[PDB]
Amino acid sequence: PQEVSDIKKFIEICRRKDASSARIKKNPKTQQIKFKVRCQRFLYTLVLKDSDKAEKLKQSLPPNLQIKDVPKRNKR
Amino acid sequence: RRKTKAERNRIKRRKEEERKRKHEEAMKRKQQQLEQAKKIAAEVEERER
Amino acid sequence: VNLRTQKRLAASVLGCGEGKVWLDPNEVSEISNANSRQSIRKLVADGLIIKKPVTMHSRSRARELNLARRIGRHRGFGKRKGTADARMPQQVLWMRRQRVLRRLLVKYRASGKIDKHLYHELYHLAKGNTFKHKRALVEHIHRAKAEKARERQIK
Amino acid sequence: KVTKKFIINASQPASDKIFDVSAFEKFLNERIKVDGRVGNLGDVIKISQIGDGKVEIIAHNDLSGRYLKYLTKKFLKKMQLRDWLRVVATSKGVYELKFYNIVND
Amino acid sequence: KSLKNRAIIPRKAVKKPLSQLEDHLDQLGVDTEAIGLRARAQT
RNA sequence: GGAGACGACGGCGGGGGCCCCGGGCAGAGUUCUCUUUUCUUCUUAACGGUCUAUCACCCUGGAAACAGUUUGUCUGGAGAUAGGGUUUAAUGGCCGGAAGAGCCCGACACUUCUGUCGGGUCCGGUGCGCUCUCGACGUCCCUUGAAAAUCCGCGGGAGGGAAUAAUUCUCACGCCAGGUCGUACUCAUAACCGCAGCAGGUCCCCAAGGUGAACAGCCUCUGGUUGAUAGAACAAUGUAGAUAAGGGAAGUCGGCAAAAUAGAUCCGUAACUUCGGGAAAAGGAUUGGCUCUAAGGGUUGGGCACGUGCGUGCGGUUAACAACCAACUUAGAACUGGUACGGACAGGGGGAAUCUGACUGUCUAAUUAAAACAUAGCAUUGCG
RNA sequence: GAAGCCAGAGGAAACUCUGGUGGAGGCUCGCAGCGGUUCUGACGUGCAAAUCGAUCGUCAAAUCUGAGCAUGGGGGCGAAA
Numbered sequence: 063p064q065e066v067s068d069i070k071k072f073i074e075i076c077r078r079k080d081a082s083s084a085r086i087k088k089n090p091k092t093q094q095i096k097f098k099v100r101c102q103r104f105l106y107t108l109v110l111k112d113s114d115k116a117e118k119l120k121q122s123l124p125p126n127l128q129i130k131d132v133p134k135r136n137k138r
Numbered sequence: 139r140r141k142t143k144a145e146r147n148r149i150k151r152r153k154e155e156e157r158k159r160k161h162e163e164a165m166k167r168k169q170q171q172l173e174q175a176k177k178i179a180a181e182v183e184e185r186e187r
Numbered sequence: 188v189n190l191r192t193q194k195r196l197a198a199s200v201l202g203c204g205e206g207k208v209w210l211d212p213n214e215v216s217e218i219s220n221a222n223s224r225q226s227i228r229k230l231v232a233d234g235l236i237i238k239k240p241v242t243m244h245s246r247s248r249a250r251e252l253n254l255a256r257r258i259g260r261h262r263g264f265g266k267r268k269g270t271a272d273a274r275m276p277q278q279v280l281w282m283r284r285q286r287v288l289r290r291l292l293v294k295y296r297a298s299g300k301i302d303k304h305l306y307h308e309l310y311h312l313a314k315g316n317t318f319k320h321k322r323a324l325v326e327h328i329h330r331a332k333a334e335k336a337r338e339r340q341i342k
Numbered sequence: 343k344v345t346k347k348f349i350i351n352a353s354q355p356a357s358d359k360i361f362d363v364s365a366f367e368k369f370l371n372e373r374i375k376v377d378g379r380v381g382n383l384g385d386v387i388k389i390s391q392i393g394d395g396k397v398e399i400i401a402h403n404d405l406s407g408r409y410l411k412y413l414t415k416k417f418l419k420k421m422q423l424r425d426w427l428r429v430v431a432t433s434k435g436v437y438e439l440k441f442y443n444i445v446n447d
Numbered sequence: 448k449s450l451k452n453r454a455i456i457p458r459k460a461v462k463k464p465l466s467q468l469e470d471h472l473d474q475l476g477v478d479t480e481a482i483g484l485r486a487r488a489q490t
Numbered sequence: 491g492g493a494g495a496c497g498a499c500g501g502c503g504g505g506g507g508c509c510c511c512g513g514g515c516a517g518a519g520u521u522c523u524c525u526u527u528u529c530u531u532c533u534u535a536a537c538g539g540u541c542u543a544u545c546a547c548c549c550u551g552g553a554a555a556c557a558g559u560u561u562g563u564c565u566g567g568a569g570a571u572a573g574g575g576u577u578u579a580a581u582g583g584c585c586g587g588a589a590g591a592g593c594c595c596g597a598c599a600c601u602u603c604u605g606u607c608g609g610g611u612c613c614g615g616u617g618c619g620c621u622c623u624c625g626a627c628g629u630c631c632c633u634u635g636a637a638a639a640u641c642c643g644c645g646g647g648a649g650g651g652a653a654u655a656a657u658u659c660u661c662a663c664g665c666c667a668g669g670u671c672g673u674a675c676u677c678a679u680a681a682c683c684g685c686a687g688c689a690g691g692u693c694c695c696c697a698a699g700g701u702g703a704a705c706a707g708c709c710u711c712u713g714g715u716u717g718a719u720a721g722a723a724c725a726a727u728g729u730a731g732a733u734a735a736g737g738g739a740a741g742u743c744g745g746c747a748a749a750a751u752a753g754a755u756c757c758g759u760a761a762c763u764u765c766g767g768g769a770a771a772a773g774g775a776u777u778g779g780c781u782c783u784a785a786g787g788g789u790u791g792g793g794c795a796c797g798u799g800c801g802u803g804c805g806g807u808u809a810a811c812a813a814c815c816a817a818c819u820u821a822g823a824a825c826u827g828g829u830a831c832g833g834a835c836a837g838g839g840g841g842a843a844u845c846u847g848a849c850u851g852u853c854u855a856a857u858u859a860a861a862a863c864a865u866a867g868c869a870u871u872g873c874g
Numbered sequence: 875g876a877a878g879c880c881a882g883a884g885g886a887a888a889c890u891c892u893g894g895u896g897g898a899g900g901c902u903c904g905c906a907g908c909g910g911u912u913c914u915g916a917c918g919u920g921c922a923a924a925u926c927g928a929u930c931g932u933c934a935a936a937u938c939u940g941a942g943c944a945u946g947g948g949g950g951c952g953a954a955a
Contacts (some may be wrong), residue, residue, distance in 0.1 A: 315881025
């Protein structure tokens with residue numbers, strides 16, 4: 063797993079061809095939001111403060127990329 | 139001359155403060171990119187084109 | 188009715204020893220019908236199988252004995268069983284004393300109370316077992332300062 | 343000055359006239375100790391009844407709800423209700439007294 | 448109590464019988480019919 | 491050329507885990523009385539990023555009034571101290587993984603099928619502790635404590651290389667592939683060997699709390715057992731464990747056996763001697779509980795003038811002061827119970843001599859462990 | 875408690891004395907392990923074709939031990955019985 067600290071790098075990673083899926087994790091106790099994109103080798107995580115602009119980053123993400131919110135319980 | 143324990147502790151605090159300042163500066167840079175996200179996406183698409 | 192399998196499965200499911208598994212004695216037929224871990228989990232959720240809590244091992248007496256020994260009880264000659272060195276090594280005492288004295292001498296030299304020549308002389312006296320503790324070293328330093336000041340006033 | 347509020351809700355056994363709220367308030371007044379001394383509430387701890395089988399505790403020291411639950415279980419043991427009533431933390435600082443699960447035989 | 452060899456089963460893990468609860472409240476002098484323990488008992 | 495690739499032992503320092511202490515939420519137990527109580531959960535992998543971590547190395551400069559420095563006396567004009575840097579080394583901090591997991595608690599639902607939803611999972615401290623690991627030292631040797639597969643660096647400069655652009659880049663990302671065999675269970679007072687489900691034998695890893703010097707003995711937690719034909723009675727003689735008035739070896743081939751001694755602190759300790767020993771020689775004084783006192787530690791922190799938190803130029807060694815934090819030993823004193831105070835457990839009887847083998851060591855598995863054998867030392871013989 | 879080391883007191887020095895430090899030894903008490911001294915011991919068609927109990931020797935090394943491998947009866951191996 064790798065942490066991406068730059069929005070431009072994260073957008074390029076999400077525009078890569080092997081980007082199979084992406085998910086959004088919300089941690090309200092720490093007031094943070096994580097964008098995780100699954101590629102062939104690595105899972106890339108961008109960590110942001112929970113904010114409206116962080117919500118609008120989803121619209122700048124590519125539309126063909128499937129994006130899902132993480133539920134509160136990981137059911138098997 | 140030989141420095142004292144207080145001077146060594148002051149140097150250590152100064153280095154810790156520099157590391158902290160770098161961390162907040164990097165976080166602020168990431169935030170500014172987050173508000174400038176749409177223009178960044180436009181530039182990435184233009185470069186790909 | 189034999190419940191050895193159910194007790195083994197309940198121990199594995201609850202993550203405890205088999206001696207901590209309680210099977211309901213009034214539901215022996217219903218428990219005997221459970222042949223799978225899923226049925227065992229269902230019985231645990233229904234409360235027919237529970238995990239018993241641990242047996243008490245309190246530390247209260249150990250803590251009170253530690254407090255009494257801290258304030259000085261139970262330390263007499265009738266209580267000691269090892270030799271004085273076995274209880275408290277002289278090598279450990281010497282190591283602590285030498286580290287204390289060298290730390291104090293380094294602090295004094297760094298702050299500028301003593302000069303480097305006096306530091307070296309006191310270091311070798313401390314290695315040669317002149318000073319019993321930090322207080323004795325401090326009085327020796329004060330007397331050396333007084334003698335040096337008297338010599339400077341005379342000259 | 344930090345102020346903590348605690349609720350002991352005994353409304354259901356109080357309505358069933360099993361639990362005596364005034365006796366419980368007297369018991370808390372005589373048993374809560376401050377600085378290791380009973381009868382030393384002073385201006386630090388206030389105990390009152392806010393009605394409907396509820397006891398309200400204001401603390402300005404570091405009084406703990408676990409200590410309040412300990413004293414509540416002591417009162418239940420004195421009143422022969424320990425085997426039949428349970429003190430359950432329902433919210434932050436709220437402890438409710440309720441019956442254990444009953445089976446119809 | 449047998450706390451030297453084993454711990455006491457917690458009271459919340461055992462369902463108390465309604466007859467025993469009614470009997471104990473009766474000796475404590477509580478009118479149980481006015482409060483209706485029969486509806487409160489599970490089955 | 492390096493790695494692979496290397497002994498044993500000793501103390502010291504760092505890190506993980508375990509043990510221990512305090513606070514907090516939740517749950518459980520105790521509650522005649524007492525107990526803000528006792529106990530339980532409170533966790534974070536590989537793989538990565540980032541900031542740091544002893545040795546060592548580099549730069550300035552040139553040390554006697556020698557200095558630095560370890561528990562351990564080594565280092566320095568072959569360049570020390572000091573000041574500033576560079577690097578080997580993480581099981582260290584933070585972040586990604588990762589809370590979505592696991593764990594704990596609660597409220598509903600539930601013929602079964604099945605569950606559903608809430609609340610948390612936090613903050614510190616300590617060490618001659620135990621265990622593993624790493625590092626720097628040191629000691630010993632007429633003993634100096636593997637090899638190969640395999641991987642990497644360098645020396646060399648053969649080839650191969652550009653503006654029709656080239657690239658034969660140990661960088662990032664992307665694409666493709668990974669066969670065969672073993673894998674249950676026991677590892678022993680019933681899964682092995684001893685004719686057996688035989689009190690024998692059979693190689694390792696992990697190893698909690700109390701007492702205590704201590705993986706001694708005794709008691710306890712986790713986890714296991716409660717299996718070894720049973721019931722009744724209590725004669726002799728047994729086997730095993732004990733006590734016995736007075737005497738105290740009168741017993742017996744023979745003090746055989748038992749008893750006595752035993753831990754720790756202190757006083758004291760002869761002959762002989764290869765000077766190392768003898769020695770814990772011998773012979774004495776003491777030891778519980780309670781309430782106190784004293785001693786032995788760590789961290790942080792100095793005034794001006796300017797420039798502007800650092801730089802200077804100064805000025806001062808009573809910080810010999812304050813604030814905060816912390817653990818175990820040692821000594822001294824009063825009081826107090828007593829038939830006992832290393833109260834169980836654990837745990838030398840001592841001495842005077844003689845013979846004998848120098849010592850440590852070894853053998854007759856299943857009757858002999860010894861003056862036997864070996865040993866170092868000494869002497870002789872053969873061999874260029 | 876051996877070398878080595880530090881300090882103090884002497885001694886012209888070599889050295890001497892005192893207090894520490896240090897941690898050597900086919901040294902020593904002793905747990906496990908290894909071994910096998912003693913007992914009118916237990917057992918004696920035994921739990922056992924050599925076992926059991928107490929006691930005892932040794933316990934940092936000429937210590938204990940696994941696997942792989944070598945030596946084969948006119949032999950081997952033998953701290954030699």
